[PDB]
Amino acid sequence: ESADLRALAKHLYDSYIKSFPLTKAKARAILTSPFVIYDMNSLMMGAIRIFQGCQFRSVEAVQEITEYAKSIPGFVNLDLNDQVTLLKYGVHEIIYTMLASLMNKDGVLISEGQGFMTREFLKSLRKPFGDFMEPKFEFAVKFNALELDDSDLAIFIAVIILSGDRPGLLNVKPIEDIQDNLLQALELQLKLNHPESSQLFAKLLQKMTDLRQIVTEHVQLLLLQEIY
Amino acid sequence: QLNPESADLRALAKHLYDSYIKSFPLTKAKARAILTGKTTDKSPFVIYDMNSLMMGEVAIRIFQGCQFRSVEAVQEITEYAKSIPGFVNLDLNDQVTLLKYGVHEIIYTMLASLMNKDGVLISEGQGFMTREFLKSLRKPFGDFMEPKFEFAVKFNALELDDSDLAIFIAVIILSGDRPGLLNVKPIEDIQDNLLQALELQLKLNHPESSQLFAKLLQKMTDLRQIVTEHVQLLQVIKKTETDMSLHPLLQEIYKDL
Numbered sequence: 001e002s003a004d005l006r007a008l009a010k011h012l013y014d015s016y017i018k019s020f021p022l023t024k025a026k027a028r029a030i031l032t033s034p035f036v037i038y039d040m041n042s043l044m045m046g047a048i049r050i051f052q053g054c055q056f057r058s059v060e061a062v063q064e065i066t067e068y069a070k071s072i073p074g075f076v077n078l079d080l081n082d083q084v085t086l087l088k089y090g091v092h093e094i095i096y097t098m099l100a101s102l103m104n105k106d107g108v109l110i111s112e113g114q115g116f117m118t119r120e121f122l123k124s125l126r127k128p129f130g131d132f133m134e135p136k137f138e139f140a141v142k143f144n145a146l147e148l149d150d151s152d153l154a155i156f157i158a159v160i161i162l163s164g165d166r167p168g169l170l171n172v173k174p175i176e177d178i179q180d181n182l183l184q185a186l187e188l189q190l191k192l193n194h195p196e197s198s199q200l201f202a203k204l205l206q207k208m209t210d211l212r213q214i215v216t217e218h219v220q221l222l223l224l225q226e227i228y
Numbered sequence: 229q230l231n232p233e234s235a236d237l238r239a240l241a242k243h244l245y246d247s248y249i250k251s252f253p254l255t256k257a258k259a260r261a262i263l264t265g266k267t268t269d270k271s272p273f274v275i276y277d278m279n280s281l282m283m284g285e286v287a288i289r290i291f292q293g294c295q296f297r298s299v300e301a302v303q304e305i306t307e308y309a310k311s312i313p314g315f316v317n318l319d320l321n322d323q324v325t326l327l328k329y330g331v332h333e334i335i336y337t338m339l340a341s342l343m344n345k346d347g348v349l350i351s352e353g354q355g356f357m358t359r360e361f362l363k364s365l366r367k368p369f370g371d372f373m374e375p376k377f378e379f380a381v382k383f384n385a386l387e388l389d390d391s392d393l394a395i396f397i398a399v400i401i402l403s404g405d406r407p408g409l410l411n412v413k414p415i416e417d418i419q420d421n422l423l424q425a426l427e428l429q430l431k432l433n434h435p436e437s438s439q440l441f442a443k444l445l446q447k448m449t450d451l452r453q454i455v456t457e458h459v460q461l462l463q464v465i466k467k468t469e470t471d472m473s474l475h476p477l478l479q480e481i482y483k484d485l
């Protein structure tokens with residue numbers, strides 16, 4: 001069985017690379033030369049306008065995530081409504097996962113890494129804008145201390161999408177069966193890639209709690225308008 | 229065959245199951261025995277309406293009883309937690325922090341053991357109160373137990389028995405991502421050991437059960453949600469029912485949760 005699992009993991013990893021331009025390996029190299037937004041004069045040279053821009057980029061993400069999901073073995077063979085339902089409820093969770101790749105404790109890469117917007121400047125935004133990104137920063141510092149890389153996140157992202165508990169699925173069985181196989185593939189992946197990281201698998205799963213917590217909290221704070 | 233590492237995880241499993249039996253007078257095993265007619269001596273009285281309530285013996289009188297059941301559950305969980313190796317060795321402040329946030333998640337975990345899709349065991353298993361009688365209570369008391377039922381039916385589908393739950397509720401208590409924790413690292417190393425012990429336990433007790441470990445852990449999402457929903461509904465109760473008194477042990481657990 002362990003053969004197909006490695007083959008599943010590599011399959012997911014290649015697809016992840018093709019679907020997501022800005023990988024985690026790339027983002028970290030940059031964070032360790034982008035234009036820095038630390039202030040208002042800084043931003044101009046680069047409140048409502050900032051929050052709408054996160055919206056624009058979030059919409060582009062969903063298309064990337066959607067393309068990635070269709071590479072997940074068995075995903076397209078699912079009931080079409082079930083596919084739509086899985087992406088509908090899954091993309092927020094995936095966006096925050098992947099946003100963590102672009103953050104450190106001091107700020108976030110924007111514009112596919114061409115910029116960097118400081119955590120402090122974000123906080124300085126008047127209410128309720130100045131509070132939308134602080135909880136994601138809190139989650140990212142926790143998340144990134146796991147030091148996953150892109151081949152780990154490729155499987156992780158796939159497991160999130162194949163969640164058999166989205167509201168209103170029609171045929172939960174093949175979803176959980178795929179998720180079952182993805183979890184097996186994640187577990188072996190973490191074991192070979194992090195032999196020293198004890199029970200990394202378990203601590204990763206526990207972050208879905210956190211992730212879902214962020215997503216519900218974000219929702220609450222929340223023609224062109226047609227597009228969003 | 230099993231090695232010295234496995235053998236230490238097995239002994240921690242045995243020790244926690246043992247303490248669990250000593251701390252919780254109504255186990256799942258007994259609850260299931262009562263709910264499924266393995267009884268001629270253990271069958272419960274069934275409350276499904278006002279006269280059946282009257283016969284065993286409103287929406288506040290029920291609520292005051294579930295809330296003082298909760299208090300003596302906190303005590304049982306508190307007794308069980310002291311038995312988790314390393315728990316009492318941690319900073320006293322963290323000990324209370326771990327209890328403050330963990331108690332509710334464990335209470336609804338264990339409450340599931342007393343539930344089927346149709347109702348819930350009460351008064352140590354002597355009684356059984358139907359899901360319908362509860363959902364029929366005046367607002368917002370009718371909204372009280374429905375999320376718990378919905379959790380339980382999914383959670384009960386995992387078919388965990390008590391030796392599993394003992395380790396799982398120990399993983400819950402020893403949660404290093406709790407608000408305000410002084411020393412997270414000693415907490416994580418205990419939970420890391422619990423997680424190893426749960427992982428082996430699930431694989432030995434449920435070998436035909438693919439990825440039960442992962443599926444069990446993902447249920448922590450559902451508990452956190454039950455807790456959140458419960459707090460909100462308690463917020464509403466305090467405004468509409470200012471003559472209703474909540475219990476101090478429980479006051480302290482909700483302050484800034």
Ligand SMILES: O=C1O[C@H](c2ccc(OCc3cccc4ccccc34)cc2)C(c2ccccc2)=C1O
Nearest residue numbers: 020021022050053054057061095098099109110111
């Ligand atoms: O212009 C912008 O870019 C920014 C940005 C927004 C979301 C974002 O999410 C990261 C991300 C989310 C989902 C899928 C991805 C796939 C590949 C790489 C990153 C992916 C990344 C950059 C961004 C922005 C604005 C406000 C707060 C945070 C970021 C812009 O104003």
